[PDB]
Amino acid sequence: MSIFTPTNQIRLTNVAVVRMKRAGKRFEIACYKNKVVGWRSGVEKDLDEVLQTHSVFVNVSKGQVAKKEDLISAFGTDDQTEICKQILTKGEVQVSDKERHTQLEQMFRDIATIVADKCVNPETKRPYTVILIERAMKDIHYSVKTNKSTKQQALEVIKQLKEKMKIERAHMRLRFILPVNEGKKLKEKLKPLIKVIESEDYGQQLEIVCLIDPGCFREIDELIKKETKGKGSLEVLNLKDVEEGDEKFE
Amino acid sequence: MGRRPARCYRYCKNKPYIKSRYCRGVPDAKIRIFDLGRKKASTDEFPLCVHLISLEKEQLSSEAIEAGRISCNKYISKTGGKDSFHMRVRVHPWHVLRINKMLSCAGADRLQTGMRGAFGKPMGTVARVNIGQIIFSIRTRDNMLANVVEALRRSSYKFPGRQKIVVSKKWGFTAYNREAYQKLKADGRLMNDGANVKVITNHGTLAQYAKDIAAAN
RNA sequence: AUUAGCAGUUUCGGGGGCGUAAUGCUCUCAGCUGAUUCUCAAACUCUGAACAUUUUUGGUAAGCAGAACUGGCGAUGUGGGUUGAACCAAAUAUUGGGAUAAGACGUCUAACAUUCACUAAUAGAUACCACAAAAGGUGUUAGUUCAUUAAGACAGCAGGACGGUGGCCAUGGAAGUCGGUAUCCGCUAAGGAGUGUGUAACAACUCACCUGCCAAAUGGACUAGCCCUGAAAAUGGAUGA
RNA sequence: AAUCCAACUGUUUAAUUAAAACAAAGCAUUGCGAUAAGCUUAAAAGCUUUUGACGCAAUGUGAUUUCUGCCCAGUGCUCUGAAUGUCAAAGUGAAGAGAUUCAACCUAGCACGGGUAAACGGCGGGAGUAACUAUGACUCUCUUAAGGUAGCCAAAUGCCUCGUCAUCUAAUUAGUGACGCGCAUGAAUGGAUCAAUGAGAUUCCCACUGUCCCUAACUACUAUACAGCGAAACCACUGCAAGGGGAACGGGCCUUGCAAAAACAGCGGGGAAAGAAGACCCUGUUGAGCUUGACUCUAGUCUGAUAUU
RNA sequence: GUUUCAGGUGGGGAGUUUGGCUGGGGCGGCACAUUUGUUAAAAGAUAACGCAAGUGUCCAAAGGCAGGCUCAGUGAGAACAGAAAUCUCACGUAGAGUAAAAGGGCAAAAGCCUGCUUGAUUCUGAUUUUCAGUACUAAUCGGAACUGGGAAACCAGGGCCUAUCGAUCCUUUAUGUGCUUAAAUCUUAACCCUAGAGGUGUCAGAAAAGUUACCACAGGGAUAACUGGCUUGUGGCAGCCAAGCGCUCAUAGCGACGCUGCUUUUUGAUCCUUCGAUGUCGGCUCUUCUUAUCAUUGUGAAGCAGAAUUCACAAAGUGUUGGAUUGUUCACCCACUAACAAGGAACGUGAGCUGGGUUUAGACCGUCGUGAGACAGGUUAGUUUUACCCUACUGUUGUCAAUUGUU
RNA sequence: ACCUGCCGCUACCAUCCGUUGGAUAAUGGCUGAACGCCUCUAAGUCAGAAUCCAUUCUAGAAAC
């Protein structure tokens, strides 16, 4: 050249790294961003079709191949077949853009599908309106993160829906089993707190009091009624959140 | 093929690698099924035979073979009744093709896993033939012949190299012509075994048809 | 290693009508065993071969890498292949005449005559060697098969191309012909319950099918020679010109 | 208009780097009461000491502010430690004619046991689990002791990555706010913020519109001639091109296109131009500088003994 | 204290190392010693990081020998007992077994079972295998001593055979009424003579860690990075066939499964040319070129009523944009437009540019590393020299001396 | 220095100017056989692109 030497750096980065941190040692595989994803959600093609290299590195970028001994130490296996598979299944993948987008979409769907229980119905129902939930998610400007789980996100979104504004929703039917004469007292107590229907009064028999309680703070609620009553008792539930009752503004 | 375009597996070279106790990653062949039509149909009931045969020694892929078979599969209602149809291929892709892969597909230069230890993983299963070895065969009744040759015609396109179609003078899957394969029935010295034939045993057997009579039933 | 049905079976596996499920009858499946066939195996064999070419290993392949035999550029050029380390001819003291070699013999450029076919293509023209394929072609040449034909043909044009009957279906209707099925007979040289066009559908025309005339050849199906199609890449352009 | 950094004032690479580097006060640690600390010298002898802890010597951090969470397992550093192991030379005994040989007793150090993390450093992996509704508070376990606390962040620290959401724009891989199971952030390895400052790095807006749309004008070295003024330059040969084959991009060879002295001023298309027996790269049984629980060594040192005594 | 010696400390310093092969080199693996099978082209011989496997051991028996017996498997019977226990008889030229790999060899055995033994003993001579006809490993044959087995012939140099290992020195062990210690002949003590073990795995034998982005040297195109050369897996592009899509309808328009191609505008494979240096990437600038025609023109199709598209041909004559973002081609939006089509030309163009990156010295962060330091990890700052030569080109003088009359 | 500012040079930062014949391509035909028909084709030939070549335009040959 002169002094002017075409380096253009070590060897091109252009594939999914799958970083497995076993025995405190990084082992990696040449695959593709999509292929690995496909493999790990059902589409079991071929082991060297999903892998652009059917061998294992320690640094895919720098072009370094691991010691057999290291593999043995870590995985208790020598054959690259098994090791490679392991890496594929339980190592840190690099998704594409497409895959990322898909993931995002999935998350979006499951913060309206989970919120379909606590759905945004118009003036009257028209009970589902799941499309409208989805629509609303980005009208408030929400970070639909794929790091966090769906349930957590659902919790977050309902709080925002309060300051949309269209009120928080999460109502079910708690059928409280209440024995002896304190049941009546309890009923009297909790009438301004939440709604009371399908009631009965009994001194020599259990009382099936059906209430309409918060569903996303339900366990806590359950805990603080028994204590109030004094005596131990049973208070059954549905599942988590249901759309049997009214979900217009409630 | 999938990893290759069949231009590197066009011509016969290197000694035969197979699905063995030395290979093992060897994939399953693209067809393990080789007959099409009435396999119950008799040696006698069908007396018409056409072959497909290469003129050049070439390695036909298993996929290719499959494709060929599923022309003649579909040329059957067009022919007229699957009842009047047999097929057997008579070329099974025993032999396996090697592929050292080029680890670089979007970038990254080896000179370390380049062409050193660069020995193929077996991918590809394939059949060798020569300058006349059969590659499809069709037994049938004497009704369909312009039909079967057209199926073959389709098959011809699905195969590498210059093929050829010859009508045998036999009854289809038999070593006797017709001049012979009436004399066997006519004289009545034939012995039947379903799709095949046997013939009685005089110059076939002698040491075991010396003091024997059960050998003329 | 591995495909195909066939046979004798199976209260020894299982399910159907009969029978105790049946393995008994009548069907299929499963397993065993007997007779045959498909394809076959570098690491198998009952058996067995006298850098250039031939063999061969890896490789998608490379002017890649790697072996075998022999041959070649090393004290080896000359003549030839337009030109050229490997191809041929063939070995190099200095000469003359001769006759050949390889290769040429329009002109380049020493070297011509004849004779027969082929091609009509911006084609094609000195192995190596500087590219061409599968598949197409009513281009022309050669050729092979079987068929039609003096009961008169081909090609053409002229005439006829009917009835039971709107067969049964579907269907106001679809009558040969939205579409489907069975698809039979009468009379005739002659006519499919019909090849298409067309009609809401019938019809009409056209075909199959039959005769008139002209007057002797005709029809298909392949086969391989040259030519064409395929056949696009980068300064202007190379059968060497 | 704001972000990153460094506080500043200051300083530096004797010919590419003035920087965010260095420095710096402020904060902290250790050493040390004279025959001390630290260091210099073969030797003798010295310096800090024109000294005495409100100090000297050695480190780290780096102004202020607000903080510095846990770990002595490892490595280092220390110890009036248990030990009653190992333990050299000397000396002691035994044995053997002797040479010599074999026993105890046994220093420091190592081994051992405690101390120490503003010394180096580290601050998880798996089960459940705050309706796994869950970010992982909490429990249980495993190693290598502890298991990332407060802060902070796609930051100059984030591969995936143009991360997601938000703004700024007509349009933004740029910036900035937010989010943050953080490839691989984080508390004097100092963490967090920030006034003042900055030939500092980034952005955005106003900002005098020849950078550009698209150039022009004009004013100044060239050209000419005079002198000193084809110095230096040059150096296989030379210099017309198209394909070909050729150690595989020929100016020479093959075959083609073509061409007619001598010159001028510009041009940078070529001469695989010129400037260095390439430093990138790899080979040499070729070296250096530095490192370290390489191999070997050594001053210095700590301990033991003889002798002076 | 001072000598004088000894033990530890001792990268504060001293000197020196730091394998080899290798489709660049390191990461990798061992193909570095040896075995079998194939590679191996019917003696031998015959390579790669060629393929499938093995070796550093294991055995008082898993050695020697003699005698007896017959295994794997299957059939038919038989309290418990059936798919399995054990007991018969049938068939069984081996389908078993034989330390292990694989191939071979083997039935009055080479297997199993018994019995007795320790030829897994020593001296000496020859050979083979590899080969230099050197060593060693291994193996073979013949003798002499001494033993063993069995009547006896016979067999017995370890394992049925092909692998299961190692110089000199220096030690250490055995051997001998051994030799030698050269001024008293003795005593040891030592050395020798003879034969073994200690082990070198890089295996005919380099006591032996790192790094250098502060580096240096002799060299190398034998050996990488840009270029060109082959190639075309991969990239793009093109066909051929026609199951299907397409209301109907294979081919208007597509076209599965499958096959043949071109291409050198992707990248790899490669290492032929260049390391006594072709100035690496991008963007500006500019010509020219190719067509695989985006527009244009002239046409032919359509599932073409029109407009609007879609497909085909001739055709490269002319056109093929302004920005935002990014070092940037590539990329990714906005914006106009007839269209914003693909490319080439030493990945056109550094004595045309800036240097944005990349590629040195300074630094920062992260990660890794005991550390010196590393990072196709980011970050920031970091001299683009020479034409006055030859040509080619731009324009300009001069010549046209046989462009014929002194012109 | 500033405001004017001539000649001059210059700005799609101004103005004026950039043609027409044959030859073909694809393609559409015509007559028309090979092959009594039939066919744009074989003989023969009609139309016909930004094409081709001329016309127009720059230079003007060791050319007259």
UniProtKB/Swiss-Prot annotation, chain A:
Matches recorded under SUPFAM superfamilies: FYSH domain, Hypothetical protein AF0491, middle domain
Annotated consequence of substituting E44G: In SDS1; uncertain significance
Gene Ontology BP annotations: bone marrow development; bone mineralization; cytosolic ribosome assembly; hematopoietic progenitor cell differentiation; inner cell mass cell proliferation; leukocyte chemotaxis; mitotic spindle organization; rRNA processing
Domain of life the protein comes from: Eukaryota
Transmembrane regions: none
Keyword Acetylation part of the UniProt annotation: yes
Keyword Protease in annotation: no
Cell location: Cytoplasm; Nucleus, Nucleolus; Nucleus, Nucleoplasm; Cytoplasm, Cytoskeleton, Spindle
Known function: Required for the assembly of mature ribosomes and ribosome biogenesis. Together with EFL1, triggers the GTP-dependent release of EIF6 from 60S pre-ribosomes in the cytoplasm, thereby activating ribosomes for translation competence by allowing 80S ribosome assembly and facilitating EIF6 recycling to the nucleus, where it is required for 60S rRNA processing and nuclear export. Required for normal levels of protein synthesis. May play a role in cellular stress resistance. May play a role in cellular response to DNA damage. May play a role in cell proliferation.
Entry's disease: Shwachman-Diamond syndrome 1: A form of Shwachman-Diamond syndrome, a disorder characterized by hematopoietic abnormalities, exocrine pancreatic dysfunction, and skeletal dysplasia. Intermittent or chronic neutropenia is the most common hematological manifestation, followed by anemia and thrombocytopenia. Some patients progress to bone marrow failure, myelodysplastic syndrome and malignant transformation, with acute myelogenous leukemia being the most common. Exocrine pancreatic dysfunction is generally the first presenting symptom in infancy.
Record note on quaternary structure: Associates with the 60S ribosomal subunit. Interacts with NPM1, RPA1 and PRKDC. May interact with NIP7. Found in a complex consisting of the 60S ribosomal subunit, SBDS and EFL1. Interacts with EFL1. Interacts with CLN3.
Annotated protein name in UniProt: Ribosome maturation protein SBDS
Source organism (scientific name): Homo sapiens (Human)
Curated annotation (Swiss-Prot), chain B:
One biological process term in Gene Ontology: translation
Protein name: Large ribosomal subunit protein uL16
GO CC entries: cytosolic large ribosomal subunit; lipid droplet
Pfam families per UniProt: Ribosomal_L16
GN (gene name): rpl10
Record flagged with keyword Acetylation: no
Subunit structure: Component of the small ribosomal subunit. Mature ribosomes consist of a small (40S) and a large (60S) subunit. The 40S subunit contains about 33 different proteins and 1 molecule of RNA (18S). The 60S subunit contains about 49 different proteins and 3 molecules of RNA (25S, 5.8S and 5S).
GO molecular function terms listed in the Swiss-Prot or TrEMBL record: structural constituent of ribosome
UniProt similarity note: Belongs to the universal ribosomal protein uL16 family.
